[PDB]
Amino acid sequence: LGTENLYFQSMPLQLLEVKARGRFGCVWKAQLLNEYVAVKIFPIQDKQSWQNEYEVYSLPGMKHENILQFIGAEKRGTSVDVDLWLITAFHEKGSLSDFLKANVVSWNELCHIAETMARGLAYLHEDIPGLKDGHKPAISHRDIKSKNVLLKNNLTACIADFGLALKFEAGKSAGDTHGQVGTRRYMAPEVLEGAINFQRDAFLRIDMYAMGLVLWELASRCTAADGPVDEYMLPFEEEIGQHPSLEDMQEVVVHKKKRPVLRDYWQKHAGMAMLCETIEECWDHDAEARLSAGCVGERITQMQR
Ligand SMILES: c1cc(-c2cnn3cc(-c4ccc(OCCN5CCCCC5)cc4)cnc23)ccn1
């Protein structure tokens, strides 16, 4: 009964269903022309995050198999009644979190998700001069988690949601983050302590800590374990549940120095053993001790052998 369309850049669009709840907007599955897309709608009060994500996607070189594909962004409506839209590709399998909740992964499936994920993060982190669109800066994501990794039909991963992302220009100090912070559960101990004056490398190391946790999520659901695979739980859920306070997290991560358990039986398999070692180095309390994104990709290659 739907002959009426919305229009985006003169093209017809129909909203289907709200599929996800962002930190900062709701995400709709929609049809634009003859393809499905995602329309992320932010209220006007979250203009800063919309603007940030738009700016990040506007940087040179921000098209890559392992970065969620940008389509466009626009302010909508009347200056009285405003919404902000950001349109990306749509991925029907959803986030790595959604998938791991419904499925176990084989070793080969895990390796593919991890390799593609680590490739996207490493690209995001890389400063690359000489692109046709300009000079790509290093970009920290600042909210790495399984819910921000989307899977394609073949389980290829891409990094999504750049509302908190921060670029670095090699002749300037790290710009203003406007008081906004990532998901508590995935926060590095230095972030939880309330440390300040973070600069580029500190921000990258914060991403790599969160990445360790995502890599644990995969490990935790992999059938290469020499024993049973438990039901999916978020990092730290076993210890502090689904809805932790900042103080809950400080206690578990900062004061007790605990991490999600890497079970010894997971490490019979040579590869899983290297995976667990890699995870441990990613989430080290010492930020300086943590692997780079490029190093993690090296390890995942080494792992596949
Ligand atoms: C963040 C995310 C996105 C985004 C792009 N695609 N996309 C897809 C989803 C999503 C899609 C499907 C979801 O359903 C749950 C899993 N289903 C269950 C039924 C069988 C298929 C898999 C849940 C979430 C969420 N967000 C996005 C766009 C912009 N910013």
Author numbering: -10 to 0, 191 to 484
Published text:
Following secretion and activation, GDF8 binds to its type II receptor, either activin type II receptor A or B (ActRIIA or ActRIIB), before a type I receptor, activin-receptor like kinase 4 (ALK4), or -5 (ALK5), is recruited into a heteromeric signaling complex and in turn phosphorylates primarily the TGF-β Smads, Smad2 and Smad3. Within this complex, the constitutively active kinase of the type II receptor activates by transphosphorylation the kinase domain of the type I receptor. Here, we report that dorsomorphin and LDN-193189 activities, even within the TGF-β family, are not restricted to type I receptors but extend also to the type II receptors ActRIIA and ActRIIB.
Crystallization trials were performed with both dorsomorphin and LDN-193189 to explore the mechanism of inhibition of the type II receptors. Crystals were obtained of ActRIIA with dorsomorphin, from which the complex structure was determined to 2.0 Å resolution with two protein molecules in the asymmetric unit and clear electron density for the bound ligand. The structure represents the first reported of the ActRIIA kinase domain and reveals an active conformation with high similarity to that of ActRIIB (root mean square deviation of 0.9 Å over 289 Cα atoms). Differences are restricted to the activation loop, which probably reflects the inherent flexibility of this region. The binding interactions of ActRIIB are predicted to be similar to ActRIIA, with which the ATP pocket residues are strictly conserved. Modeling of LDN-193189 is facilitated by the previous co-structure with ALK2 (26). Its interactions are also conserved with dorsomorphin, except for the larger 4-quinoline group, which provides additional hydrophobic interaction. The strong binding of dorsomorphin to ActRIIA is additionally demonstrated by our co-crystal structure with the ActRIIA kinase domain as well as by our Tm shift and ITC assay data using both ActRIIA and ActRIIB.
